[PDB]
RNA sequence: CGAUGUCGGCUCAUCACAUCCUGGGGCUGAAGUAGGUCCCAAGGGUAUGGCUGUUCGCCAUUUAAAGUGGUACGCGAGCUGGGUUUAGAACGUCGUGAGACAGUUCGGUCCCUAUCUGCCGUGGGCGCUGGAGAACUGAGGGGGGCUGCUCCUAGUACGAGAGGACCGGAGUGGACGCAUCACUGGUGUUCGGGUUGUCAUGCCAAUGGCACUGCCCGGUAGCUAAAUGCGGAAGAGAUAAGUGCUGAAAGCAUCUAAGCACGAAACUUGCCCCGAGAUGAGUUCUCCCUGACCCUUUAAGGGUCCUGAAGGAACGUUGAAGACGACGACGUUGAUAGGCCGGGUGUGUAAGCGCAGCGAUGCGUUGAGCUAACCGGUACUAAUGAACCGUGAGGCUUAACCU
RNA sequence: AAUUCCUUGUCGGGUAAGUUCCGACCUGCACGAAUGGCGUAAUGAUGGCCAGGCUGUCUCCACCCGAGACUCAGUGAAAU
RNA sequence: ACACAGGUGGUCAGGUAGAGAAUACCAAGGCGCUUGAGAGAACUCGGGUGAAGGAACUAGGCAAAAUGGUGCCGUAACUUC
RNA sequence: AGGACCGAACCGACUAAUGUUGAAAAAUUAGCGGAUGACUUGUGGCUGGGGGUGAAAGGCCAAUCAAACCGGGAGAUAGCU
């Protein structure tokens, strides 16, 4: 979310533990997390998962404790921060399924993919 | 911090312009003891308006 | 800032401020007029006039909250033996401040705050 | 002051259900993708505010798959449809936030004739 | 195009059958009573004078009373001045007034801010503080330099340093209004407008919009 | 040299333009995209990290861009002391040795209550020509001027293909600034509850003190940001580099000499704030005062008595105003504060009694009891009638008007 | 290397990025065996580096509670 | 130098909780520290609590935050056992 | 048994903040080290200035130390201000 933000991983071939190096986008950006795309390092990875530790790449944050308010004024906040890995020059997915719910907010390009693939929306 | 030139006896008065007491200028007399007293104020032997409210 | 908010800090904290109110309500209520700085008075005010609108109504409960605040029990017997029938038909302003002159150690804006219907 | 207290009273809906919190709530919100518009049923736990009028919400939990997915879901507000009570749980506090943030702990139930 | 007076009645929401839930403010706009029209044989400009609200008529001083009952009689609360640039209005009162606003769109809401006070330098320019553990000696949360030694030799006029904060006008502009409602008196404009609640406000037609 | 503190970082800046981005152009070995180079242009903007004491530099990842310089290599009566730059100690080298090094390593006290200028805020006196209460005109001054991405034009122009428009539109962001608290939250020592240890109210029960608010759990008002609304514009004038039309000097020719039309985020307006102490003190509306005497060194004056006007000031209750002044509301023809009644909110079924249980405890009464700064009502308490300040028709010269 | 100027030497390692660190190589300006050479468990308010927990250190500040600061009464300095 | 937040040898040692001469609340006993009264700006000192991130701060985790007791399991590389 | 371990009194002084015309001519508040010993403290005594004493720092020898303080030479001298 923020720089030096550890995150969980939604998708399967990103592995567990990731970092946030930098939030992309924005000039003097601080604070991103919604549908924002961060690059990222491998902070800790399983052997399974297609990316290695030390590697970076970009990801979108899919969960945020902070949470997403809805027009109506609503607060849907999830436990803990995730984010589903992105190749850096394509920002596709690298996992073929996605974990856990996911936001209506994360429905712009791309992303219509994640929310396909995740089963609760 | 210190200054570097004495202040004049002119700049002393000038700046104690605003240190001058304000009066009174009005005392209040009660209606059935015709002694003053501060308006909003007991009259010092126990009155207020017309009515003795303290004893002491 | 202080804005919409109530209360004077009267330059003591909160232990120091609820021990004088008690203190200053069982003076009050024992003597039924006394000398206290303007801004106590007033702030006197809110502390002395709830517990006579408690001890209208006498039970159990009344006389326990009116024990716990104030903690002495002979206030809490004068205000609902005495007080209460004094001030049943009276709605609310059982205290009255009179300003008075101001105190010799320290200039200090002084009044008299006293139940309504004393005697003398 | 009082001409609030008048529009904000004809925007509520006075066909709230009445429930505690530690209940366990579904509640069917609106969801418009396109021009079709459906239900979604959002079950857990809650933790309440009582009714600051027109401004009033209700907190539900659910852990969907390991992960506690929390809605605030304002009361009045036209995307809540429907809210059904279901089970109701007997708890000794208004806010439940230790109680929900727990992974494997549930608010129990107890009805001593309730 | 002119003007209204109003007090502020606070925030509320308008529940949209959408769900957007438009954030909005309340202003009760009465009739405002015109005082005086100005022109440019008398005056050197083309505005009306209004009054609205009530007074007691025991506050009212004798010259305010004079000014109101030439050119009919009114009790108000203040006068209020709003320029024309092409409307023609007589010196009796506007009956109903806030249905000007009904065609309107957007409006600009002014109003004295909320006063904050002897307001410092992190709280009214957004100023950042030093460090507070590393050392800093008593300078946590102060201004810093404030000029650049002996060349200047001074400090520039618009140095940004503590001082009041609020009881200042201020203009909020391109504001959509809600709903005018006439016969409750209401102007329902989304957003936030200036002032404490009870405060007056003039609202004008948007000069952007 | 009877003392001008040293690099760097933090906070805060300000200027120049030899312009990094954005704006306007010329040439191009400029097909488009993207470039190179030069001219005009200072309005705004112009990164976060690893290393090192570092400015630097290198590196990672951004961005429209991560400008270059001046300001005692800006800024220590603003902060820091990592560095050089004391006194302890060691290593390498030099010297017999004391010690030394334009080498290294560890440690190593950073004072000031602001007189004057300067700024930032806020007031008293007087002036503005009779004195008041309000509304203004705007001479000036300040603020604000950033920009990305997706789509339509359009896969159009252009193009061997690959690719692909730097006109005109619409949406949605990053950064910044202003306001506000309806939502989402934060705080909430002045609300409710749990609970450890002890002391006390005789005792059981119930409470209160103290232990950081004892430790917590929630939390109203208010303030707030991370929450929400909005804005930097459009337009007009005059322009800069540049582009021209007509057109002689110089029969042609030529943007200029006579004329004329374009042209940028620069300038002047337009938007927002202060603003007639604007001594050049302005305007408009309204209010209020039209009595005698004495002396006189008479453009002029002084005094006496009677009279005190509109209004202000004071005093009190106070405020979403406030350091204090100041500003706003109210003063018995009263809702200005506190209290009181009702509601809302918040906490979570009080005390007591009954039942069950060996007991802790549970159940009922009971969503009970307390509850603030909130909302709506109510003169119960305090806002007393005065008293004070301010006066009594306002100078002299000259013009349209009437005696 | 508490020593190496060049120098931030070069290989392996740790981080997205490592003039610091570790194991080293030997081209040791200018190590070297009681002016001790090299290792060494324990110990250290010792030096350098990494990690987990933890957090207002920070992004980026916000509220509240007390003592000052402001106002009033009494006493009443200083450097310059 | 002061009716100065410093220094000053020895003796006695109640209850409850507690290992305790810690610490908390209190006995006996002594005190409120010789200027007060208001308001509740900036800023300073001493604290409490903070959404999300969590060392991105910085010369450096400086400072804060954190862990903390008894009983019982268990527990290494090297070692001078 | 332990120049053993954790830790009050006691001894010391590692970091930070405040103070730096202080409450104090080195203290306060949080943490810190040692705490059966090369420990600590009371009362006397002994060592005297180119001398003492030093688990060594130019440390200490009465708020004074690369040679204390007090009086004398002494009105040293001063091409310097």
């Not at chain 3, 009267?10 to 120091?16: A, P």
């Not at chain 4, 509640?27 to 021009?35: D, L, N, Q, R, Y």
């Not at chain 5, 109003?111 to 030093?130: D, E, M």
Request: hydrophobic letters at 35%.
């Amino acid at each position: 979310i923020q720089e030096q933000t550890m995150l969980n991983v939604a998708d399967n071939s990103g592995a567990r533990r990731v970092m946030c190096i930098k939030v992309l986008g924005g000039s003097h950006r601080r604070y991103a997390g919604v549908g924002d795309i961060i690059k990222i390092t491998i902070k800790e990875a399983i052997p399974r998962g297609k990316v290695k530790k030390g590697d970076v790449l970009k990801a979108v944050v899919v969960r945020t404790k902070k949470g997403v308010r809805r027009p109506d004024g609503s607060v849907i906040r999830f436990d803990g921060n995730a984010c589903v890995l992105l190749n850096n020059n394509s920002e596709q997915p690298i996992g073929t399924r996605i974990f856990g719910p996911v936001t209506r907010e994360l429905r712009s390009e791309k992303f219509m993919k994640i929310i396909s693939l995740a089963p609760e929306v | 911090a210190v200054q570097q030139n004495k202040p004049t006896r002119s700049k002393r008065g000038m700046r104690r312009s605003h240190d001058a007491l304000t009066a009174v200028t009005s005392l209040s007399v009660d209606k059935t003891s015709g002694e003053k007293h501060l308006r909003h104020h007991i009259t010092a032997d126990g009155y207020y308006r017309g009515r003795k409210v303290i004893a002491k | 800032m202080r804005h919409r908010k109530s209360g004077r800090q009267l330059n003591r904290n909160s232990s120091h401020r609820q021990a004088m109110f008690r203190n200053m309500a069982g003076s009050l209520v024992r003597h039924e007029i006394i000398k206290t700085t303007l801004p106590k008075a007033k702030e006197l005010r809110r502390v002395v006039e709830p517990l006579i609108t408690l001890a209208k109504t006498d039970s159990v409960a009344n006389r326990r909250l009116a024990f716990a605040r104030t903690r002495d029990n002979e206030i809490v017997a004068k205000l609902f033996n005495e007080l209460g029938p004094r001030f049943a038909s009276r709605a609310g302003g059982y205290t009255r401040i009179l300003k008075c002159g101001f105190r010799a150690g320290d200039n200090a804006p002084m009044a008299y705050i006293e139940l309504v219907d004393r005697s003398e | 002051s009082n001409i609030i207290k008048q529009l904000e009273q004809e925007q509520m809906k006075q066909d709230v259900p009445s429930f505690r919190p530690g209940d366990t709530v579904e509640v069917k919100v609106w969801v418009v993708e396109g021009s079709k518009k459906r239900l979604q049923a959002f079950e857990g736990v809650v933790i309440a505010i009582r009714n600051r009028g027109l401004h009033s919400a209700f907190t539900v939990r659910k852990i969907s798959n390991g992960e506690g997915v929390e809605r605030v879901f304002q009361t009045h507000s036209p995307v809540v449809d429907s809210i059904s009570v279901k089970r109701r749980g007997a708890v000794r506090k208004a806010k439940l936030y230790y109680l929900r943030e727990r992974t494997g702990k549930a608010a129990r139930i107890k009805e001593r004739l309730n | 195009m002119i003007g209204l007076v109003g007090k502020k009645v606070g925030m509320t929401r308008i529940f949209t059958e959408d769900g957007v839930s438009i954030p909005v403010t309340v202003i009760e706009v009465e009739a405002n009573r015109v005082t005086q029209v100005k022109d440019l044989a008398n005056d050197g400009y083309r505005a009306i004078q209004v009054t609205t609200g009530a007074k007691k008529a025991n506050r009212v001083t004798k010259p305010e009373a004079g000014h109101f009952a030439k050119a009919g009689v009114e009790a108000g609360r203040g006068l209020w001045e709003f320029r024309l640039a092409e409307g023609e209005e007589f010196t009796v009162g506007q009956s109903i007034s806030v249905e000007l606003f009904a065609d309107v769109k957007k409006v600009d809401v002014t109003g004295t801010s909320k006063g904050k006070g002897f307001a410092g330098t992190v709280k009214r320019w957004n100023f950042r503080t030093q460090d507070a553990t590393h050392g800093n000696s008593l300078s946590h949360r102060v201004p810093g330099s404030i000029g650049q030694n002996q060349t200047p030799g001074k400090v520039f006029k618009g140095k940004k340093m503590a001082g009041q904060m609020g009881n200042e006008r201020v203009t909020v502009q391109s504001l959509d209004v809600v709903r005018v409602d006439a016969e409750r008196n209401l102007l329902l404009v989304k957003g936030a407008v200036p002032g404490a609640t009870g405060s007056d406000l003039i609202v004008k037609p948007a000069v952007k919009a």
